């Protein structure tokens, strides 16, 4: 997410034994890095 | 060629050369005003 010129990333690495879909349950996400990018962001793509 | 010379040149640097001709190491620390959230900042001291 982007807020106040701040780029925020929250992450979680829970072990999942269901390969079909995300399992029913709850696991909160802890923040990792809050780097002050300040570049307005409107698009996103993923690498492999 | 006629009225033609290499724009680049090298000056012989010697320890016994004049002080004016002696090379000095020069660093310029260009700054800029606070138009955005600051990232590089001076250390902030903390009391006991
Ligand atoms: C948001 O993006 C716009 C262009 O769509 C830009 O003018 C503006 O400065 C941006 N805001 C920030 C905080 O980067």
Portion 18-37 of B in contact with A at CB < 8 A:
36-37
The experimental technique used to determine this model is: cryo-EM
Residue indicated by tokens 């993923």: A46
Please answer whether residues A32 and A10 qualify as being in contact, where contact means their C-beta atoms are separated by less than 8 angstroms: yes
Distance of CA A37 to the CA centre of its chain: 16
Using a CB-CB distance cutoff of 8 angstroms, which residues of chain A are in contact with residue B39?
36
A9 DSSP β-pair partners: A33
Annotate A1-48 with DSSP letters as a single string: -EETTEE-EEE-------SSSPPSS----EEEE---------------
> 10 Å Cβ neighbour count for A8?
13
Strands A2-3 and A6-7 turn out to be: antiparallel
Using a CB-CB distance cutoff of 8 angstroms, which residues of chain A are in contact with residue B37?
5-6, 36, 38
Q: Could you tell me how many helices (H) and strands (E) chain B has, helices first? A: 0, 0
Name the residue at shortest CA distance from atom 8 of ligand 1.
A40
Please work out, in degrees rounded to the nearest 5, the angle formed at the alpha carbon of residue A33 by the alpha carbons of B34 and A28. Answer: 135
**Overall resolution, Å:** 3.3
Please answer whether residues A40 and A5 qualify as being in contact, where contact means their C-beta atoms are separated by less than 8 angstroms: no
Residues 6+ apart with CB under 8 A from B23: B13
């Amino acid at each position: 997410k982007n807020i106040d010129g701040y780029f925020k990333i929250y992450s979680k690495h829970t072990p999942i034994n269901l390969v079909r879909d995300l399992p029913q349950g709850f696991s909160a996400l802890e923040p990792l890095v809050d780097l002050p990018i300040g570049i307005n962001i409107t698009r996103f793509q993923t690498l492999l | 060629g006629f009225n033609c010379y290499f724009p680049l040149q090298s000056y012989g640097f010697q320890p016994t050369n004049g002080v004016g001709y002696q090379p000095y190491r020069v660093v310029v620390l260009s700054f800029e005003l606070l138009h955005a959230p600051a990232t590089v900042c001076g250390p902030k001291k903390s009391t006991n």
